[PDB]
Design a protein around this ligand. Structure first.
Ligand SMILES: *Cc1c(COP(=O)(O)O)cnc(C)c1O
Ligand SMILES: *Cc1c(COP(=O)(O)O)cnc(C)c1O
Lengths: 433, 433
């Protein structure tokens, strides 16, 4: 199928290029001032990325005027859609009270309380400006609290712009003392955490890996991390920047597993810049300016616009009930997609939990990024371009994200588009056994 | 004297407490959910910080209704004041077009171009969500570009929440291989950079240290850094997160010293969450997704609200011309204050450049944080509380920051308040000689 796939992809590039001349012009101009016209690597794809001009609800428009149903929703940050009035009105009201207030304010405590109550494993928290900052601070807290240096993470793990892992840390990863272990391998985790126990400050893990392909952590593996971390005296940190959305009180609570710290981000700030870290009060005490040894400084951490937007979103829109309902809608979609793939006999599946899923061109159980390392990326590209042709805006990597305004008809369009993808590319796709 | 200062401080605490019961109530309530009720360490001060309820122009109101002239302006981020309609209208218009757009957009390129034009040592840039992230990325870029690991920084250096230095890296500082050298010591800088030449990836420095107390970098020292970095093959990185506002095209341009990379933050995002790193196109090429080996990820980096607010602020309000004019007003103020202190014979002075200055209770030249090691912190507190009594909201650390809405009358009131401070605390303040 090698040559045929190359040809199909060349055809797709041509069709995309011809359909999007304003986006191509914009790309060429913008490449003068930013490398590859780009400020967030995931937003770039070949031959050039679409410029997005406008959004409303779960609709996006590109520079050439195409309207799409949005199935990516700012990589899970955009759970409210692009134009929620509750969010916009909260931000406008905050701005009318004054911004850059340079002190403790009347909004930060409301959002802090809400988060501690909704995610009770967070006894106290502090706000950051990103998920990346939240994870850096959580790691810093654990190193100091334990007096140890080694940090256990998992291959495929993504914790932010300077905290990413393959078998080894990514080229942009901060040089902490990382021990990188295989995801969903409880035996190796127990053995290695025991071997290095007295040196391990922290075990940092996503309860479902996001960036690596929506790969659920198996309960026996996640429990092994909790058991081993407690055994050796390390802190367990759950990175729930993505997974906090997956159940009314997040995925760790759904699983009944308690981490010492938890990090949050993306949608929790109402669509605005946001992160948070929190957990045990005795660990968070390190940052109490009255008595603790650690400073945690930043400029925009408690900004009134983020505080207002986050509080409005979590109280009026993405409530605990709404999180559960969106999860149910996502489970139904993933089941339909997997049934379709199986019925058609193709080696294609969708992995994930609830409102988050990812297309993969492999058969069998997907338990780690290793199971996906051989996937033909040209097929992911063909899928992406096919979806654009079917008026659906997805991610190049095949990550599908539900948001609140997405209609049942929109979801039907996605399933139909996968059907037409399989129907039209049947000669190119790997066959199931 | 020592006993009398303790007494005066106890009195100030009591008066502050009695006058601010709503702020005290708010602090106690919020301390349940955030350590010390706090999310940004600099905002905490004893006995408890004021809650800020409202801002308009260069005025702030606390929870108990006290109105202050604002002389801190979000630690330089708030150069536009608290309610600039140009900023608010830009943000509103951006929100109306849709947020969380999940792609390259129509606003990021405009702001990138504007910044590159304003600071021509920046050939290309990428946006981040904070100054801390910008510095992390600049360092990461330099390590990869050079294939070296050692990073030269300076005592008292502040580069963000996980990049702070006293004589040694602060407890929260990421464990890069830092070599910490004395600020404003040209001879030591040349010797140590040359001695460790082959190991040094980067020399990272503020052209005027901000957090350590508005300490100008001397021409001989900064030139020694440029020369030494070039000699050994290291990159020079200027952290202009604060200093970019100090002249029409930033401090480094005024001094005529070209760094290989420059980091920016605070006011450049129009008061919204923001940072940027940029410089030589060949270094920034590491991040071009078409060809470069480095990813730079981050959810909110190119968000339309920041892109809109930044562009509106820089084009309509804080233009290069406005930066020059505000710097002139600041120079005039600093000279007035220094003349007053000298005339009164007190060991008190204000250090800095242009629109940024800092009170210090020390006599003689301030060249590094080491010169401030024996200062009595209780005197800074007495000043802070005195200024509150005189309807002036300042920083506990004595950092004074001009913003655009401040009137000449507001500035006169600051000078008068320092006059009344010296007049009323004569017996308590150290003498010049
Ligand atoms: C997006 C994400 C992060 C990083 O958050 P940013 O705000 O983009 O820095 C960290 N962890 C996970 C699991 C994420 O999905
Ligand atoms: C404020 C500041 C930073 C950090 O920026 P944040 O947005 O608070 O992370 C870095 N460098 C200097 C010189 C600063 O003043």
């Amino acid at each position: 199928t090698h040559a045929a796939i190359d040809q199909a992809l060349a055809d797709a590039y041509r069709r995309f290029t011809d359909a999007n001349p304003a986006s191509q012009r914009q790309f060429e101009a913008q490449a003068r001032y930013m490398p590859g016209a780009n400020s967030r690597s995931v937003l770039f794809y070949a031959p050039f990325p679409l410029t997005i001009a406008r959004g409303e609800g779960a609709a996006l428009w590109d520079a050439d005027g195409h309207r799409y149903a949005d199935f990516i929703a700012e990589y899970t940050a955009g759970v409210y859609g692009h134009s929620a009035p509750e969010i916009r009105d909260a931000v406008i009201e905050a701005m009318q009270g004054g911004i850059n207030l340079t002190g403790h304010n009347l909004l930060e405590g409301r959002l802090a309380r809400l988060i501690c109550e909704r995610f009770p494993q967070i006894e106290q928290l502090r706000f950051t400006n990103s998920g990346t900052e939240a994870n850096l601070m959580a790691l810093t807290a654990a190193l100091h609290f334990t007096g140890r240096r080694k940090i256990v993470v998992f291959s495929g793990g993504y914790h932010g712009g300077v905290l990413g892992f393959g078998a080894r840390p990514s080229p942009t990863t901060v040089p902490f003392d990382f021990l990188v272990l295989p995801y969903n391998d409880a035996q190796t985790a127990r053995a290695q955490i025991e071997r290095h126990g007295p040196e391990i400050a922290v075990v940092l893990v996503e309860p479902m890996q996001g960036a690596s392909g929506c790969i659920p952590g198996q309960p026996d593996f996640l429990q092994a991390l909790r058991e081993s971390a407690t055994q050796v005296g390390a802190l367990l940190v759950f990175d729930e920047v993505m997974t906090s959305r997956l159940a009314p009180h997040g995925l760790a609570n759904k699983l009944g597993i308690r981490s010492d710290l938890t990090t949050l981000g993306k949608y929790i700030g109402g669509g605005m810049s946001f992160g948070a870290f929190g957990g045990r009060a005795d660990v968070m005490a390190l940052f109490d300016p009255r008595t603790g040894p650690l400073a945690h400084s930043g400029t925009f951490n408690n900004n009134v616009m983020t505080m207002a937007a986050g509080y409005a979103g979590l109280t009026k829109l993405f409530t605990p009930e709404a999180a559960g309902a969106l999860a149910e809608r996502g489970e139904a979609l993933r089941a339909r997609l997997n049934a379709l793939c199986a019925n058609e006999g193709v080696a294609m599946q969708f992995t994930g939990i609830g409102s988050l899923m990812n297309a993969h061109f492999v058969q069998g159980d997907v338990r780690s990024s290793e199971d996906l390392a051989a996937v033909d990326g040209r097929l992911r590209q063909l899928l992406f371009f096919h979806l654009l042709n079917e008026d659906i805006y997805s991610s190049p990597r095949g990550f599908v994200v539900l948001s609140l305004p997405l209609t049942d008809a929109d979801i039907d369009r996605y399933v139909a588009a996968i059907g037409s993808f399989i129907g039209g590319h049947g000669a190119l796709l790997p066959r199931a056994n």
